[PDB]
């Protein structure tokens, strides 16, 4: 399954200490993400496997200086408005280094050692955002650093910023004097486009699994039928992503306490409730199928690019010739960044549709509008702000998923009449993921709210049942009338009348009055009316007070749910609670905490816990 | 290799007789295309294989239990004839609905499936509105409208006949069906139309892809490229499957090429004044094709999975006595991959446009004339300029089309369909995109054969100018040093830079000749001047006439050794075309039309398979 | 000065219907209504006027002829005949393109012979036009080459005479008493060097855009009437204070259309009963319509001006200044003005479609339709009447494709023609897409009007059904001998409860009618506190016998408020002229059969009759 592979990726991202750059051992998207985000991870350039092939190649080129330095000069052409982040630059530095290990570039080993040292020192040049059609200009800033160009500014850690010559001295390096072919070796790569795409693909894999898992949590809170994930439905339409996502979904909902409430809910008033769930849940495995396959396929393609000699000419020293091709063409990455962006927009649409169902009372199966706890709804608009936000997120996301590779210009004196635009495309897919992160944060926040509302719903109904039951005994109401009233206490959704339980124009008293008149006609063919009036009177004394007490006490079914790690993480570890008029905490403050957990990777802890033993 | 698979697809499309519909044997995109386009291809609904599970499921629904089904079809017959879905797509959809029923999940009667079998074989299909599906209730309601004999539904019988549905059933020996429980839903609740178009789209995408890959080699031959770009080491070290596989073909197509022999000769003369590397349209082609190849191959698998699936709801589990409520009617797998293919197709078109552009510009065509104009009178011959303009028009619309459709999902049908695939709309646009690619390939191929003729004439013309300069050097009694310089210039100068007026004192030949004469005077330092004066004098008497003669001979051969001979022989001989010039009266339209028609009806696969025979 | 864009569009519709002859003289402007008239009405003729322009044309012809002193011009035509037949540009577009090329010549800048212009005139009025390949133009060398090919009698060029006959170009010239032309100086270039085809399509695109716009604007008022909306949204002051000209003018129309509406009378009555359980404001699809329409109105009108400017221009090169003895080298062949505006209009057309989709969506959902049944089903048996659910799915399909089409074309410029045409307009491709967008918009307006006529019927049945329920309850309360205060409670419920919530089974104790009645019966018992229970039991008994059969009787009788509505023309047109009725299981016709009739009427412009009737009196 792809579920295991993404777990393998998350584990690798966490467990890795050294990234082996030897020319044999593959560098995954997890390893690139690790170097970029975790500063304790170091680069290990191994001499045993590639020092020989590299030096031979460097020797051949020399057997056949001002020229190579004036190429760098002209390619230092980007403008600072916003720039490429250090995470991206360092990833590109790693990827250019990795390209050299195959011994086709003819670069000196000494220069490769300098890259290794510069990475482990956290030194990286300030690189302008735009200029590459895919990565001559951005890679010329890495090359400019190695030759100690004063115009190129370099970072040392989070704070220090100095010119390149002084940066080289602080790490024990002297400015390089470029030999033949070396200048072209440095700038002629797909390193930047593939750097951004690597982190894009790691995040896309994590967030894909995250979205998949949260579909089960959505099922639990929306009172859905877990039937939609039955293996036979997907065996008979065997899209690999459809089967695998449903397999996870079936497993997550197998022993669900919320699904027990679901079956109980649809057993009462069966004819007046929907038989099938709406598409945002029931259609989820079919929707996820293409999205799963797109993100998995692109990972492979991105990894192939990471582990490749993307340079020109390809030096074939064993046959005394330089091979002329275009391995610097990032079309593999370019095109797959477009496909992924469309897949991400599809994940966003799934999230938007699910969130919309959750906010609307007519579709939320008992949940209050906007998930407003209230009870006073005139001063509690709940998650309406986030709902509006989700449409703003989805809308921009759909726009972003337009392709970039369809805008190829004839470039560079018409020499580059086809070019990938891979970096541009990767940046847009990165921007789309940022928006997807915003959407997952809000979704998870809302469902934790829905968990709380469902558990309180169970507690409030049981109170209404108790108060009606005891007062039926207290008022000496017959066995028939008691059964009718208890049914109404179980049937009508508490959130329809929570605002004012004893309001004569709200569903509870409405159903009660309808029952009382029905039981009068049945028992007729006078003191019953006296007993019923006393029941109504005493309900206005006890019900409101006891319903309030239970809610205030609340301010259990999740403890048996496989999504407990997510609920416990959001509520306990991030220090949040039920959203109401009484909690002095803006939705921003709540969602920001969840977003930050997703952005830094802390969300993987509850994710892995949730999926343990799958 | 994907090359093997596409050849396998082409072979199956050509040589299939019966499509086995049994619920175990897969139906490929080739089979779907074969049924749609070839009339003598029949459907084989094999009873022994799947009558059992179908009737087990059918009777299960009968145990658990008709005006309800009538109302559903009547409801969904809601399209408008503005445009219509072609019979090819409707018949493909009919086969795909039939195949879905064979899995024993739909609860439909075997009789209904038998009716679909005979309706297909009798070439009967309903008139279906183009639009209305979010993916395929409305379009599938017209197939169900036929089966129940709705008078408002019009059916086609072949190419000539269009009658109401009750009469259409009568003519093929069928009676209108009264629908049982679940049957009305079972007929309309599928991805049949979306997947039908997607199937023909995917077959075409494979054929045209291989065709574009092959013509990259032909482009190398005519543009005087370095076949080095296809060297296996360049691609093994950047091992994208599509990059390696495409390069493997191009290395093979260019091995021992007569045109590459000319290329080496061309670059050996005046090496330090010509492009050291080829431009990206050729050199970068394997890297460019890589994602496109993978996109089209992966999407072929996905569409074929949808073809061979039970896209229905509810899925009847008759063995465990329960009706499973899912959403197998959601064609998102198809919809998303149609968007991806369309982006890839746009990339294929961009490659072709870029190559075509190089070919048309003298600065980039390496000796070739602008617009590939033969002339010799260039003021009244503009060659392929018209086709050059149209190529930009094709590519422009192609790039526009490649915007995704799946990013425009609306919350639909009482917000019940809050996610829908729009697969049929997406497939339709990818279809339209492939029609444009066909237009581009047609022009591209035509421009290549034109370029073959121009290169071969270039050689014949050069051998004449050499022979004329050689003989006149003797007749004037010029020294062996002078003869060596003059024969060098005759070899070096591109013949098409002076073919308009060979003895014009301002054009490149006489310019180079007047340079050598002054170089040979200084080196040999006055009756030599009189011999050089007689050399120019006798040149303007014999040169133009002899160059004209061979051209005339040519208009009334290294492509013989070339592997692209089957293409050249197909365009020139089978399609009856010649070299484009003022003296040829056939329009660019008349020539390219013949090529396009051959691409459209599949005739082009013959020269393609001949070109690729022995490639393993 | 324009009084209102609504007056201007009505001006276009009148001009389209009334014109008999199109005057081509180089001074009198051709409008998008004229171009549409020629393309669609075969009785309309072209009149080339030899008084004003004949002199300047011949002067220009002579000057070019003098400066030259023939195969060159024929070779241009030969190489430009490079289209492929896969699909083709329809005769309407080609005939429009011929007129526009002819019109360009009248300015005396092209150097074309008057005889060629006379041939174009003759070919147009004879309904002769070449079959032109769809693609090839980056904007219109290749498509225009086929008009030029016809004039020189190229055997490969096929020509239509009317709708039936297809003959080669020499034979087509023969049948109209013309001989193939021999091209002189510049004449080859002068025929192909224009924006005629892009501007032809754009012209009938802009004419349709104007008509469909006004139609959409007007139908917003009809939507207000059926959805029970608050006309308050169109109040002048709201828009006076946010003074977008399209916003003011659309609201002005809507205020007028809703002023004395009998339907708006029902709206005020509806929101008076149970105020607290009903929305205070309408949803955006209606309330936000003038604001939404504002840029859409302005885009469509501004583009009409730009297209018309191109129509009445010398789109040719070089421009021959015979008065100052020199040829000026410019680029009037660049159709960028038409190109970019076609992109803007396509986005506006998508915007109009979104407005239609949203309004349609509210209408189909019971939670949003303010009393109307789901999918606008009549029933009463809702299990076999799914209503307009089919058209509702189609509306999502239509809108989704429409939003996709509204992506720009002008952003996809390739460096073309040996990098000489390094900026090209792509105007014809863009115009083609905007045309496709308007086709879909026609499908959307068709469904929308069909749905709203269904809604009118349902609202009028609603008023008939309720007053019967009121009558049955009122009389039984007297017969059963119930007190006046109890009678007032039960009559309130009869009026308050929406009728379509219980019409399926009126005397079902689980549906909202009996629920309210049982609620009120228990409340009255508590208020008057034994034989009262006997009288109430008799009330329930006699209601379950009498009510259902009477509700059916009035429903069958139905199978009035519109008669005072300004939308009566539309309702009568759809119902009487097109021969339709209320949609139910008792109606044999499919949704297709009904919507088709409305679509055809939109397509051939029959819809302008009820539109003009609906809007007469408006200033």
UniProtKB/Swiss-Prot annotation, chain C:
The keyword Transcription does not apply. It catalyses: L-phenylalanine = L-beta-phenylalanine; L-phenylalanine = (E)-cinnamate + NH4(+). Changing residue 317 to X: Abolishes enzyme activity. SUPFAM superfamilies: L-aspartase-like. Could be used for the stereoselective biosynthesis of beta-amino acids via amination of cinnamic acid derivatives. The keyword Cytoplasm applies. One of its GO terms (biological process) is L-phenylalanine catabolic process. (E)-cinnamate binds at residues 193, 281, 287, 317, 389, 417, 420. It comes from the Eukaryota. GO terms for cellular component: cytoplasm. One of its GO terms (molecular function) is intramolecular aminotransferase activity. Contains an active site 4-methylidene-imidazol-5-one (MIO), which is formed autocatalytically by cyclization and dehydration of residues Ala-Ser-Gly. Changing residue 287 to K: Increases deamination activity with beta-Phe. Increases beta-regioselectivity in the amination of cinnamate. Abolishes enzyme activity. Its main location: cytoplasm. Pathway: Alkaloid biosynthesis; taxol biosynthesis; Phenylpropanoid metabolism; trans-cinnamate biosynthesis; trans-cinnamate from L-phenylalanine: step 1/1. Changing residue 193 to X: Abolishes enzyme activity. Optimum pH is 7.5-8.0. Keywords: Alkaloid metabolism, Cytoplasm, Isomerase, Lyase, Phenylalanine catabolism, Phenylpropanoid metabolism, Taxol biosynthesis. Homodimer. Homotetramer, dimer of dimers. Belongs to the PAL/histidase family. Phenylalanine aminomutase that catalyzes the rearrangement of L-phenylalanine to R-beta-phenylalanine. Catalyzes the first committed step in the biosynthesis of the side chain of the alkaloid taxol (paclitaxel), a widely-used compound with antitumor activity. Also has low phenylalanine ammonia-lyase activity and can catalyze the amination of trans-cinnamate. This is Phenylalanine aminomutase (L-beta-phenylalanine forming). It comes from Taxus chinensis (Chinese yew).
